Amino acid sequence: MKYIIANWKAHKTLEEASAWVDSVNKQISQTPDVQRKLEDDELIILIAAPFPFLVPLSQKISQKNLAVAAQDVSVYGEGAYTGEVTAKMLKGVTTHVLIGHSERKDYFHETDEVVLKKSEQVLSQGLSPIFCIQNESNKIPEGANIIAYDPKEAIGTGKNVPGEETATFRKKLNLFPDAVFLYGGSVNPESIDEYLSHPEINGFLVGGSSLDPEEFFELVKKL
Amino acid sequence: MKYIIANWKAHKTLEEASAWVDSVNKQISQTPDVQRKLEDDELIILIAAPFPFLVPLSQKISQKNLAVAAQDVSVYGEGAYTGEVTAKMLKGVTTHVLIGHSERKDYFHETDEVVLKKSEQVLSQGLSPIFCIQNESNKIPEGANIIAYDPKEAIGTGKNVPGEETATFRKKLNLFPDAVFLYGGSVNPESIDEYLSHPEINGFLVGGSSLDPEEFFELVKKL
Secondary structure, X not given: OEXXXXXOOEOOOHHHHHHHHHHHHHHHHOOHHXXXXXXXXXXXXXXXXXXXXXXXXXXOOOOOOEEEEEOOOOOOOOEOOOOOOOHHHHHHHOOEEEXXXXXXXXXXXXXXXXXXXXHHXXXXXXXXXXXXXXXXXXXXXXXXXXXXXXXXXHOOOOOOOOHHHHHHHHHOOOOOOOOEEEEEOOOOOOOOHHHHOOOOOOEEEEOHHHOOHXXXXXXXXXX | OEEEEXXXXXXXXXXXXXXXXXXXXXXXXXXXXXXXXXXXXXXXEEEEOOHHHHHHHHHOOOOOOEEEXXXXXXXXXXXXXXXXXXXXXXXXXXXXXXXXXXXXXXXXXXXXXXXXXXXXXXXXXXXXXXXXXXXXXXXXXOOOOEEEEOOHHHOOOOOOOOHHHHHHHHHOOOOOOOOEEEEEOOOOOOOOHHHHOOOOOOEEEEOHHHOOHHHHHHHHHOO
């Protein structure tokens, strides 16, 4: 069960986003080994798209284990919180919610308490958090089954964490042995081979190399 | 040119939201005086819906001067800002962007600098900010043509600001004489008559009394 997440971050218009889905759809139908892994639950591809694109894009998708995911969610539930997108609103549109991304720590001063609250919202609606952490000091909820290690220094820098340090890291975390562990941080078609030889690493969170749907599919083809 | 904005805040599922649009659509077609004002640009109805609902709901709408609006927008432009919805992304989906809501000051510590940055993003994409203020101390950009006075003490409390104090307030703001000025804060079908006799007030921002599409249409029928 390999995971790969295209994290567009704050990129793309509705039109650019829909073109991306047509490019990935066509490549999937053109690549029978990828189709096999998807159909056999050996692979899942998550498109972590901005909130306003989740529903239109998900209407363009019929491939099993290809699905949209939210990039974030409100710390609040339903209520008078102008601007907030709640887990309950996502219950309709997606099954996976990325939370705790390093960028939200840097730019919006998200703390562990904040992310843990976001995690409780996601789980209480029956959704799956993809719980991002920056290091060993970030607290991890026990309802979290999918963790993404995305350290700030590796994001967009080319300085990906050595594969064996990444595998070592996973063994040292506050995680059930059967949890899903992803790596994110300058994963590109050259970088990714450094992690595929470590079974402790179950997938990838891909930012930069996810914007071009062809580059992203080079990554998909390697899992 | 009267404005009325249904601010759902952090309410509704996709299904609840779509039902709302069918209820308002049917009432409009059933109310020829409302249809006339809409067609003659005497009235605009803005549905300020959560980000993931903007595109599906706008596909259910063919009535002129009935349109969706965003409740907020990122301080950032396109870039590596996981979770952010930018003005550029909204250029596709909506023409109006609510910014500066009092709830975002209380819960997310938005400051004038923050809201002014959000305003610059909205305008640079050719969209219309609906610029909310809490009092006379909030700075107002000059590119802002639509201002909504939404003081915290009047929100959800029943303590709406007296109509004449509201009209007086508008005359004292840093605003061009031809700017659009809305009032928000416990506007309901009883409250609203207190403001309709003051021509300084060009419309309403409606939170609580907007969730029920029938109550909301009682408000619409009074403009």
